[PDB]
Design a protein around this ligand. Structure first.
Ligand SMILES: CCCCCCCCCCCC(=O)O
Ligand SMILES: [Ca+2]
Ligand SMILES: [Ca+2]
Ligand SMILES: [Ca+2]
Ligand SMILES: [Ca+2]
Ligand SMILES: [Ca+2]
Lengths: 242, 296, 57, 236, 242, 99, 57, 49, 49, 48
């Protein structure tokens, strides 16, 4: 025979090893591949699509699980009200759990890129307003003043024909890639925080709802890229499949 | 000679409009320099998702950005680079004592919807065409490596299924069988895309019978024969008792993947196999909940 | 000489794989080409506007 | 020149003055079957205008409590118009659709309706009845909209051909979808290529006094209709 | 030696694995291959040949097993009589069991292509007639009227010099290939049904048999192709070979 | 009555369309069929019994002893070819012995 | 250099196989050429008619 | 027989000798017998830094 | 199969043996290598100090 | 639902107050005689 000398790893079975294996059906031919609409090539093609972000994820009544998608915005009175706040980390157990992008991240360990989040006002057409949506980069604690929040990356929004408006979270990090932040220590990869304040007030005429709602859609920018991978920690099966 | 209507009519265009082309994308988009801009008529930020399109607003038009060369590769976020990873999808039990699998043989139905991990990923798309590589890990309930010999035989739908540890069907004169010892490494097998349908179907919104669909027959809703690959049989090569308590675990890896329509991830806990039935009495939120939308 | 039966047959992408057997499906997944189309899902709108423009005219 | 629009198919025409544009399912127009993708050896029937036309079927009433509804296209249209006949007489079916869900209101009303398309729409509950899986005309209603009665999050439905009807802006949505199936043709009598879901994400609200009757109508139209395997007339 | 690293599958034995093996007779030479008539190259060469189809497979007397091949056709009186009915599936346990084509299918899992079935009248030469042979595509229930049967693919046949006549079952399916139909669920691959009715009547002069017979021959068309394979389920050995 | 399989084609029977048959016929070939391992022999060398004592056994070279294989092969009248035999030795239980 | 002793010797079909030993019969079955002749069994008639024509003239 | 499974930071960590996490549908796992030679593995530079 | 004849050393594990090993992450790409001051090439560069 | 089976046209209210419906000359005869109930309805143009 031919002089061989098997090295370590012999007879081992690696889950993620790309290798060959004997064919079970000599001369088999798969049924022709018909053309089918909307085929996918890369997963990053999905991260581009915006999905409903559950900011108002407090309710869990099971009868009020549908309001987790919406968002409250009443006609305040004071100057500088805070409307909402939430984590800027996608693969975190925060509100980004609902977003498609978020669920995908659970299958990857690290990422990179900016993030877009469009907000759409559903209130009556007569409803007018102006609001300051801010983004406090990592290291900055949750602002307490609409004046302390505007010191970071923000964007004022006015209501009208263009119901929606998108806020872009520029990838501002110290590392090329970020690991999914999870409190203790692993917060070194936090993307920061996002706050929303009333620039003016929810002005409404006589005869229109005194309270409206907003919907947040999240997605990733083109410069977005994930690396590595793993099993999702966003969901776990309690009982065995029947 | 021509009614003109027949000449004009485009009826018969096998060519799809498309209107969207796939372009190269090894490195993520590179950001470019951007200075300030103050003008009317230009509203990059202002969008209207009411249309059904993901805001096309770019970083530059939002803040004075710098220039960055994205070297970050997107090769690991591809289909093959994702699905092509071995995972548990099957598990057979051939114990000595018990009511589950006596006699020494076992006929497992070819279906992977029996395990979470794998089922979650795959059910992300609606259709999927591909080849696979199966590995067989045989061992006792403890981890004990036993000098036993087995015979794995594939039984296509319509082929004689073994009925006993010594059924004639094990001659496997046509069917593909594999004989291995528990001392030798696991079995390596390559399987081609076999199905009357151009691609496996994860969700079948219809009935395969085409009959009355009575209540007692609602057991068929969702069952697609194009995913029925027959069964898998295994047994000890002998006339007597096995002498050992065995447990085979089937692992699968996908090669040459082709996914199509994408759908929402799984929200609830899987209950049945090939059944999107969920825990209706107790539904849980997609993710974690907070105490107030104004508090972290 | 080999057979042409590997699912991704007639596929637009160019896969460079390794195969020792007669059937091409027994071959590894190997290196592939990186193409994308975020628009088929992000902007599947009939008419296009652009950021600088207002979505609803 | 982006809100106004007109759709003309067969002998039907639709109008709008607050449209939010048209979306094409996965960026692809309804095309016929190629002479290589088909296996059915027999020239099918392309009735065109007689079936490829607009059909206004069901209508529902939006309320401050409505959960949502859904339909199963392949089946929905059957039993109605010339289309239904070909679907019942022939075995193989093939076609794309143009959906137009209209719902108007006044500038003093507020609400947001998500209208999306979901291919191979299977449902759970331990097995739903025929009256729930194929509620053709008049459709069916969602009991657990948060999980789309299938165990999947609705917060991730935008990942499919969708569009919104935000009363404060537009008053109707329009989608175009090409045939979708791992096969060239398929009988629509027992298999539905997909379904339509209409769920209020922003609860319809309005101060008392304004007409509380807010209807939501559904109008669809087949495209590139092709039927094969002519036989006896069947129903299900 | 040379660095090697045996992967999974080592020492395994695959039934359908095409590989090499050491020769038992170095420099052996097989007896010259003489030329022999009717050599076969591909199995589809047989599926082209028509074999007797046992439609009238009801009798099993063992003394009346020979009439399973024939077929009864008497001089009816009414309008629209039904003469016979049977499954359109080849690899099914139906009448297609007799046909060579049918038996072959048992060794394959799926198929594709149209099917031809010629009918030959054996009755007296003086016997005249006309009959409607219909084929109800999948989804269509067994017709009850000669008028309800003609709505599908049919073909009228007249008796005379050309005793025979062939009916072609056009491959009309939703899938490129079909799996052998077998009742429960796996009927999704049914090829339909075939009915035979009296277009007119079995006219006979004074002095000729008042009842004749017909023979059905089945085969596959050129566009026919089988894929995959397996052991036959059409027959099983009860006792062990002696 | 002549002894020929009707040469009638679909086209002359019904208004057919055009179809491009990509379906390969490579798996319906001789090698692609017969070239599949199968049981054809079986010897028994037990410790106790009257069948094969002494420790040896002379098996006659004939494959007509098993259904599965015999069915297929008896489809033709003549057949020329080479073969590859595999030998699976084991105890009546499945016990792998160092013999 | 190898021997020529593999049953299908002088065979009309062209088989592309793999062999490591001196004798060609030890080689695999490999890929072969696809030829057919449905007529030798379907229409082994001396005279031919055609569909359009009547079998018995 | 054993099963070595790599659990990246953020991935579900096995909690029992039979925890669901061992299905390793995504994570990289290796099965080896103590009779076979040691496991040979190549690991790339993985780090945000 | 192909005629082989494993020689001594088979299945042995040498500490200082330069060989290959199956990859754990198909198509993985390490984070770009930024430029960092004072890089070292050879140890004799230190013995000079 | 039974009316939309013929030639119809949906109309929305807004800036464009008006909207026109065109009755395509769909007849069996080149010309039509003024319909008047009994028999002479053979020239009816239909209904709206
Ligand atoms: C030979 C391996 C083929 C793998 C195909 C697995 C498909 C299982 C899908 C089951 C879905 C269902 O039955 O409705
Ligand atoms: Ca008010
Ligand atoms: Ca109604
Ligand atoms: Ca119905
Ligand atoms: Ca008489
Ligand atoms: Ca070796």
């Amino acid at each position: 025979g031919f002089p061989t000398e098997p090295k370590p790893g012999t007879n081992q079975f690696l889950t993620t090893d790309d290798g060959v294996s004997a064919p079970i059906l000599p001369n088999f031919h798969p049924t022709p591949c018909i053309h089918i609409p909307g085929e996918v090539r890369n997963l990053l093609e999905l991260c581009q699509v915006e999905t409903i972000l559950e900011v108002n994820n407090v309710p869990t009544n099971a009868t009020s699980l549908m309001e987790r998608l919406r968002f409250p915005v009443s006609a305040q009175a004071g100057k500088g009200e805070l409307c909402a706040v939430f984590r800027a980390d996608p693969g975190r157990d925060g509100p980004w759990q609902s977003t498609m992008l978020g669920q995908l991240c659970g299958y990857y360990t690290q990422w990179s890129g900016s993030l877009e989040v469009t907000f759409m006002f559903t209130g009556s057409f007569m409803a007018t307003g102006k609001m300051l949506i801010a983004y406090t980069p990592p290291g900055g604690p949750l602002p307490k003043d609409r004046a302390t929040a505007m010191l970071g990356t923000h964007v004022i929004w006015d209501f009208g024909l263009q119901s929606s408006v998108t806020l872009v979270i520029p990838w501002i990090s110290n590392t090329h890639y970020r690991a999914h932040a999870r409190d203790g220590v692993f917060d070194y990869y936090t993307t920061g925080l996002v706050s929303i304040w009333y620039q003016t007030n929810y002005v409404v005429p006589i005869g229109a709802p005194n309270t409206a709602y907003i919907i947040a859609l999240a997605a990733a920018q083109k410069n977005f890229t994930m690396k590595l991978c793993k099993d999702t920690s966003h969901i776990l099966q309690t009982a065995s499949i029947q | 000679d021509r009614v003109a209507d027949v000449i004009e009519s485009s009826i018969g265009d096998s060519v799809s409009r498309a209107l969207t082309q796939a372009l190269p994308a090894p490195t993520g988009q590179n950001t470019q320099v951007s200075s300030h801009r103050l003008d009317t008529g230009e509203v990059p930020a202002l969008q209207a998702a009411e249309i059904g399109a993901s805001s096309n607003t770019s970083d530059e038009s939002m803040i004075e950005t710098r220039c960055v060369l994205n070297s970050h590769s997107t090769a690991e976020t591809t289909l093959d680079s994702f699905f092509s990873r071995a995972g548990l999808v099957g598990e057979i039990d051939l114990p000595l004592e018990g009511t589950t699998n006596p006699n020494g043989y076992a006929n497992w139905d070819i279906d992977i919807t029996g395990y979470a991990q794998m089922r979650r990923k795959v059910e992300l798309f609606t259709y999927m065409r591909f080849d696979a590589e199966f590995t067989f890990v045989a061992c006792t309930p403890t981890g004990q490596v036993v000098p036993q010999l087995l015979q794995y035989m594939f039984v296509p739908p319509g082929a004689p299924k073994p009925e006993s540890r010594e059924s004639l069907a094990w001659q496997t004169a046509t069917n593909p069988s594999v004989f291995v010892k528990l001392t030798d490494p696991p079995a390596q097998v390559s399987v081609p895309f076999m199905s009357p349908a151009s691609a496996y179907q994860w969700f079948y919104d219809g009935y395969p019978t085409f009959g009355e669909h009575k209540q007692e027959k609602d057991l068929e809703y969702g069952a697609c024969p194009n995913n029925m690959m027959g069964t898998f049989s295994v047994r000890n090569v002998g006339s007597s008792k096995s002498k050992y308590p065995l447990v085979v675990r089937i692992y699968m890896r996908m090669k040459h993947v082709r996914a199509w329509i994408p759908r929402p991830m799984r929200n609830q806990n899987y209950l049945f196999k090939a059944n999107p039935n969920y825990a209706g009495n107790s539904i849980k939120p997609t993710g974690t909940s907070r105490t107030a939308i104004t508090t972290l | 000489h080999e057979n042409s039966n590997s699912a991704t047959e007639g596929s637009t992408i160019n896969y460079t794989t390794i195969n020792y057997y007669k059937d091409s499906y027994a071959a590894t997944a190997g290196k592939q080409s990186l193409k994308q189309d975020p628009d088929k899902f992000a902007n599947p709108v009939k008419d296009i506007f652009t950021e600088m423009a207002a979505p609803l005219k | 020149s982006d809100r106004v629009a007109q759709l003309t198919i067969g002998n039907s025409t639709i109008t709008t003055q607050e449209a939010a544009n048209i979306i094409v399912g996965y960026g692809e127009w309804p095309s016929y079957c190629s002479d290589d993708d088909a296996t059915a050896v027999d020239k099918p029937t392309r009735p065109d205008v007689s079936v490829n036309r607009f059909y206004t079927l069901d209508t529902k009433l939006w309320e401050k409590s409505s959960k949502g509804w859904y339909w199963k296209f392949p089946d929905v249209l059957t039993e109605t118009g010339v289309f239904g006949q070909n679907a019942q007489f022939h075995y193989l079916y093939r076609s794309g659709f143009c959906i137009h869900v209209q719902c108007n209101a006044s500038k003093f009303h507020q609400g947001a309706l998500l209208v999306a398309i979901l291919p191979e729409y299977v449902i759970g509950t331990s097995h739903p009845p025929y009256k729930q899986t194929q509620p053709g005309a008049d459709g069916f209603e969602l009991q657990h909209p948060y999980v789309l009665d299938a165990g999947i999050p609705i917060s991730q439905l935008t990942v499919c051909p969708h569009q919104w009807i935000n009363l404060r802006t537009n008053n109707c949505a329009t989608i175009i979808v090409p045939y979708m199936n791992t096969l060239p043709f398929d009988s629509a009598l027992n298999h539905c290529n997909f379904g339509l879901l209409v769920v209020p994400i922003s609860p319809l609200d309005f101060d008392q006094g304004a007409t509380p009757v807010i209807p939501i109508t559904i109008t669809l139209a087949p495209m590139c209709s092709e039927f094969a395997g002519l036989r006896q007339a069947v129903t299900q």
